[PDB]
Amino acid sequence: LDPRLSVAPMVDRTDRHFRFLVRQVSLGVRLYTEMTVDQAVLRGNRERLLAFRPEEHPIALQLAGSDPKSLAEAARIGEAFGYDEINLNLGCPSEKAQEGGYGACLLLDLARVREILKAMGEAVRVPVTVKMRLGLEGKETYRGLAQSVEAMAEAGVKVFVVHARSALIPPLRHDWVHRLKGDFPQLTFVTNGGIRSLEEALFHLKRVDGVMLGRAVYEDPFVLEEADRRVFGLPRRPSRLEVARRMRAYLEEEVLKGTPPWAVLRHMLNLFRGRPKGRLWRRLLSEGRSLQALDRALRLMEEEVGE
Numbered sequence: 600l601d602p603r604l605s606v607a608p609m610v611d612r613t614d615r616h617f618r619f620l621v622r623q624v625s626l627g628v629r630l631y632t633e634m635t636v637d638q639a640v641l642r643g644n645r646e647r648l649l650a651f652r653p654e655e656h657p658i659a660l661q662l663a664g665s666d667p668k669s670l671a672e673a674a675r676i677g678e679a680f681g682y683d684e685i686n687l688n689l690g691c692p693s694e695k696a697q698e699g700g701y702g703a704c705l706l707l708d709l710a711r712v713r714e715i716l717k718a719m720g721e722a723v724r725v726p727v728t729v730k731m732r733l734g735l736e737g738k739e740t741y742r743g744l745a746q747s748v749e750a751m752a753e754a755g756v757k758v759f760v761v762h763a764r765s766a767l768i769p770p771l772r773h774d775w776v777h778r779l780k781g782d783f784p785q786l787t788f789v790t791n792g793g794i795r796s797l798e799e800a801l802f803h804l805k806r807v808d809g810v811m812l813g814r815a816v817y818e819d820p821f822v823l824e825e826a827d828r829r830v831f832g833l834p835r836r837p838s839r840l841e842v843a844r845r846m847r848a849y850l851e852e853e854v855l856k857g858t859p860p861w862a863v864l865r866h867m868l869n870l871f872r873g874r875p876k877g878r879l880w881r882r883l884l885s886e887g888r889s890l891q892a893l894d895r896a897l898r899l900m901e902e903e904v905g906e
């Protein structure tokens with residue numbers, strides 16, 4: 600597992616269509632599914648919920664839940680679909696996450712978290728990792744955070760993705776994640792929260808093992824343009840037009856397979872953010888919502904940049 604760079608799990612954003620797009624920008628970057636509740640994996644349409652394209656590797660499935668055997672079975676299912684990693688959400692503070700007794704709620708029961716992670720780790724051969732917050736607003740202490748990490752490490756976890764803000768406006772404390780690395784040199788820490796550029800990511804990579812970017816990537820996928828070269832050492836550099844042409848081929852195939860065109864197009868609106876004709880690109884796709892509209896938008900862009 601190369602922990603250096605990942606795109607954050609984002610419900611309603613990081614579905615297989617957006618993940619496919621990001622993969623065209625960076626071959627190296629690790630992708631994460633939207634938070635996927637264990638009960639939905641167990642009782643829902645598993646193929647529809649979990650199937651993904653081989654190009655999306657490396658990819659982690661993020662699960663949420665509260666019961667060891669349920670999460671272990673959901674992890675087995677995720678492993679069967681080919682996921683490279685099973686990530687446990689320990690950071691969701693939403694109203695839903697509270698009623699369901701998962702996400703950030705669980706940190707208040709380290710004993711249970713421990714039993715969950717042991718069960719999950721024994722169930723699958725791929726890595727089981729965690730994504731967590733700094734703590735629950737009010738009683739955020741570094742000692743508490745470290746106590747939580749130590750407990751989860753006893754359960755076998757090695758990779759910790761830490762969204763470096765307390766949950767419930769509490770500030771980012773990336774320094775705490777830097778401190779964690781100092782206290783637990785043998786574990787892997789990926790910091791997350793408010794990182795808006797690759798340059799900012801490289802700043803943090805000097806202190807921790809990895810950086811996870813969420814919102815900045817959805818706002819402008821080409822924030823990752825230099826990642827393959829500057830982070831992964833690959834002699835590769837994407838162009839927006841090349842990515843768009845690859846997305847056109849993907850859309851054509853997906854619509855024939857029964858995918859509504861907007862399911863794909865809604866995630867392509869920012870491909871030319873800040874570029875000449877960037878706003879026209881967005882309007883054309885938003886108004887047209889079809890392969891034909893994408894074709895029109897492509898032609899105008901190809902005339903704009905050239906060859």
Ligand SMILES: Cc1cc2nc3c(=O)[nH]c(=O)nc-3n(C[C@H](O)[C@H](O)[C@H](O)COP(=O)(O)O)c2cc1C
Pocket residue numbers: 607608609610611612632633634635661688690691730762791792793794811812813814815
């Ligand atoms: C639209 C949206 C959806 C999110 N959904 C998830 C999720 O499914 N699982 C999760 O762990 N965090 C989720 N989060 C929290 C993010 O993964 C991430 O930790 C947070 O946005 C901070 O990183 P960023 O500043 O780079 O975006 C979501 C955030 C946003 C904005």
